[PDB]
């Protein structure tokens, strides 16, 4: 069931922003481990002496890299005068955030029709205010409110290439990698208590509960109206055996943030040969692969979706599958992005629902946390 | 004239230390881009509540970095409880150090006879104290005194692996990258004053000015007895039609700090080939190449050293030379290491001053300042 309650426009993600100490590392790193291109920069080569901010692209999946500078720098500015691109940034704000958190995301952007009417109707339903709509050079709109912890929901929209005062990057330095990844397709929160957080981002979106179908948790999934827009949120479950994951990110991360980021690709076999080729010289990581008798399971499960050849294949890569009434989902995880074992990556690719493709489908996955128990238990024999 | 006037006994260059934000971003891309080996750890898989600290080494250089966590993780902690390696380390003078500089240099570590010693004599000599001699697990004792800005000069002393508390990285997470970097050459610090700096630094450590032969600065290389240990510093030149380089960065790093690290390389051609092929996949950047009228220069003033190929194998990658009255210097310098126009690295070659080859040998490159002039000035035709 699908009400379609959205209470304004809502058409995609549109960036993820990451709150950095130092974009230029991060980014880099990100770039060359994720198979993004350097498309867009903000910094103190294009007159912002107010944060560093630099874009990474791979297909619709926008990733925004953003450190501030010397408050000295920009001392005799006011907001009117302000050299800042992004005019929600904040010395204070970014400097508080990455010492309680750690490296993050700051910012879940979407798309909307009208940034202007999404803030006002949010917060007359109850959304915490973050950054007051401001247009930018009369061309775009953008505004926030609190998402969960610091972390905020931020709102774009566009008249008629990011926004104003980036610039594009040099192709010189613009490297053209593609591992295959081509766009978000969900955005997970942590917090404490999830029926609050629901109710309260629920409330001001409109978003409805996305169907579905002890681990250490409980979750449910907010989404907009064509479903495209996905925002999980888990609690922890407290007393089992093994700690809740939850509660260990919420240990470290000082409090409620954002847990993990799917990435859809084209081609999760060819992003997978292509992360974990670059995962010691730079990249990413990856979870332990789940022992061979999950992959002898997966025959019964979803051989009549996979070939064998395509099963030896997810074997090979450490790729999890789960299957829902209408879909299948192919899935792997990273270890931590960073320091902390807070925020991690999830590649994704769904098979399935075609109408295009519609919007969740095979679910997120929570048919693996059964079936990974019982595939150790098989191994171990 | 080299009087031998160090006040202990100094050995070698022993490893840099970097203050992150997040210290696994940054060294996974320090790895990649540098071709260093991911060598040890202290974080919280071996037990560290307190900060995350990552080795990376090709051949004897070490770089360290290293970020804090959480206070939270250890709040029941005292220092006589530490789960710290680095028993200097404090939550709160890490992130004061990148809140105020972003990335960069927190330590220059020299390894010495006696940590202890070194520190005594060096305090009693006008040295401002920064962490007394701690004696690691009856093995190592560290000491730290004030070097310039928030820079300290690490005392390392072995009775007889990099630190207690240091665990060796796993083989499977342990890529053997090498571009043929082989250690550290010199590091170099910017102040506002080159006087006092010299006064300061030569009155604790004994070190002499090592011999040399309007660009924007006033520099001197204090160096230890077997001129291995070399800690040039600048200070920047006012009022030029070019504003001082130096004076830039103590503008954006608010105040001293370290400007550059030399990294000598056993096959600088090598090197420069691997770095510059990653340059935009995650790796560095290197300042605009000399006009070809520098490399037909090059003919008449280092003809006798280098050939014709090696001389156009310079000019491929972009090497400037420079020749003391006893040797001959490869260099090159990267763009800043991170957002800040504040720090970067030089490789360096050198050929000549063979006993070994002795420290120092072929200078500095400072006259590659006019060179690299006359140059641009004669391709301007
Ligand atoms: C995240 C996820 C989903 C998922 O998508 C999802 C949704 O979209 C919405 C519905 C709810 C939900 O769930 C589905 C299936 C998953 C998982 C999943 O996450 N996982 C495994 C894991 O645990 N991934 C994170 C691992 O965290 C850590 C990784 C590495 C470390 C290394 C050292 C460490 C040292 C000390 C403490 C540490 C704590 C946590 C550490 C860690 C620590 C899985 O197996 N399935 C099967
Ligand atoms: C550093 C050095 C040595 C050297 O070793 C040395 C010693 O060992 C001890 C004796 C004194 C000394 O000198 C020798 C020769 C050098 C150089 C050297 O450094 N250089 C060129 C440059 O300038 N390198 C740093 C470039 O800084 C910047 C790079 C890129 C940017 C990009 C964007 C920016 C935007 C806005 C502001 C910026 C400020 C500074 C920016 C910058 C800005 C050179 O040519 N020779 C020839
Ligand atoms: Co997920
Ligand atoms: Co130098």
Same mark, same amino acid.
């Given at each position: 069931k699908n009400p379609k309650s959205d209470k304004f426009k809502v058409k995609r993600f549109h960036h993820i922003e990451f709150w950095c100490g130092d974009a230029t590392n991060v980014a880099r790193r990100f770039s060359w481990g994720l198979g993004m291109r350097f498309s867009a920069k903000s910094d103190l080569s294009t007159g912002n002496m107010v944060h560093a901010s630099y874009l990474l692209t791979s297909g619709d999946l926008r990733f925004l890299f953003t450190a501030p500078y010397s408050p000295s720098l920009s001392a005799g500015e006011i907001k009117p005068t302000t050299?800042? =691109?992004?005019? =929600?940034?904040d010395h204070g704000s970014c400097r508080s955030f990455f010492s309680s958190h750690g490296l993050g995301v700051r910012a879940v952007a979407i798309e909307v029709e009208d940034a202007e009417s999404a803030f006002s109707i949010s917060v007359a339903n109850g959304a915490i205010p973050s950054s007051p709509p401001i247009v930018l050079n009369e061309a775009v709109t953008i505004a926030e409110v609190k998402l969960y912890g610091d972390v905020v929901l931020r709102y774009v929209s566009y008249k008629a290439e990011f926004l104003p005062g980036f610039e594009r990057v040099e192709d010189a330095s613009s490297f053209p990698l593609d591992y295959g990844i081509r766009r978000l397709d969900h955005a997970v929160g942590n917090v404490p208590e999830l029926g609050p957080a629901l109710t309260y981002v629920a409330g001001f979106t409109g978003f409805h509960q996305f169907a579905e179908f002890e681990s250490g948790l409980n979750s449910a999934v907010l989404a907009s109206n064509d479903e495209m827009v996905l925002l999980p949120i888990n609690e922890p479950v407290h007393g089992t055996k093994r700690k809740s994951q939850i509660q260990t990110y919420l240990e470290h991360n000082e409090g409620a943030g954002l847990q993990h980021l799917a990435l859809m690709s084209e081609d999760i076999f060819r992003t997978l040969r292509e992360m974990r080729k670059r995962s010691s010289i730079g990249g990413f990581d990856f979870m332990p692969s789940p022992p061979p008798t999950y992959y002898q399971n997966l025959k019964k499960r979803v051989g009549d979706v996979l070939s064998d050849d395509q099963i030896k294949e997810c074997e090979e890569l450490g790729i999890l599958v789960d299957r829902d009434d209408q879909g299948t989902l192919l899935q792997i995880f990273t270890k931590p992005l960073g320091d902390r074992p807070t925020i991690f990556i999830e590649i994704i690719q769904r098979v399935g629902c075609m109408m295009y493709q519609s919007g969740?489908?095979?679910?997120? +996955?929570? +048919?693996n946390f059964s079936e990974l128990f019982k595939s150790i238990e098989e191994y171990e024999k």
């Amino acid at each position: 069931k699908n009400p379609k309650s959205d209470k304004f426009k809502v058409k995609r993600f549109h960036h993820i922003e990451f709150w950095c100490g130092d974009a230029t590392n991060v980014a880099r790193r990100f770039s060359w481990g994720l198979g993004m291109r350097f498309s867009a920069k903000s910094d103190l080569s294009t007159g912002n002496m107010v944060h560093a901010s630099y874009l990474l692209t791979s297909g619709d999946l926008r990733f925004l890299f953003t450190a501030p500078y010397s408050p000295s720098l920009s001392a005799g500015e006011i907001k009117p005068t302000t050299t800042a =691109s992004i005019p =929600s940034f904040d010395h204070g704000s970014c400097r508080s955030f990455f010492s309680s958190h750690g490296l993050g995301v700051r910012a879940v952007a979407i798309e909307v029709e009208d940034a202007e009417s999404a803030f006002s109707i949010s917060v007359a339903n109850g959304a915490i205010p973050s950054s007051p709509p401001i247009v930018l050079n009369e061309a775009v709109t953008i505004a926030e409110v609190k998402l969960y912890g610091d972390v905020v929901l931020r709102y774009v929209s566009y008249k008629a290439e990011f926004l104003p005062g980036f610039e594009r990057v040099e192709d010189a330095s613009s490297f053209p990698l593609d591992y295959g990844i081509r766009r978000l397709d969900h955005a997970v929160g942590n917090v404490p208590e999830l029926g609050p957080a629901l109710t309260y981002v629920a409330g001001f979106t409109g978003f409805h509960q996305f169907a579905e179908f002890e681990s250490g948790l409980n979750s449910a999934v907010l989404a907009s109206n064509d479903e495209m827009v996905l925002l999980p949120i888990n609690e922890p479950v407290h007393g089992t055996k093994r700690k809740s994951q939850i509660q260990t990110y919420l240990e470290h991360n000082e409090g409620a943030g954002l847990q993990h980021l799917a990435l859809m690709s084209e081609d999760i076999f060819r992003t997978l040969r292509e992360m974990r080729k670059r995962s010691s010289i730079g990249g990413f990581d990856f979870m332990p692969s789940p022992p061979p008798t999950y992959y002898q399971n997966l025959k019964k499960r979803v051989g009549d979706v996979l070939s064998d050849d395509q099963i030896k294949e997810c074997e090979e890569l450490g790729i999890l599958v789960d299957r829902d009434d209408q879909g299948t989902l192919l899935q792997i995880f990273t270890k931590p992005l960073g320091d902390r074992p807070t925020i991690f990556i999830e590649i994704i690719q769904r098979v399935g629902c075609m109408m295009y493709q519609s919007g969740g489908c095979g679910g997120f +996955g929570k +048919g693996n946390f059964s079936e990974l128990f019982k595939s150790i238990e098989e191994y171990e024999k």
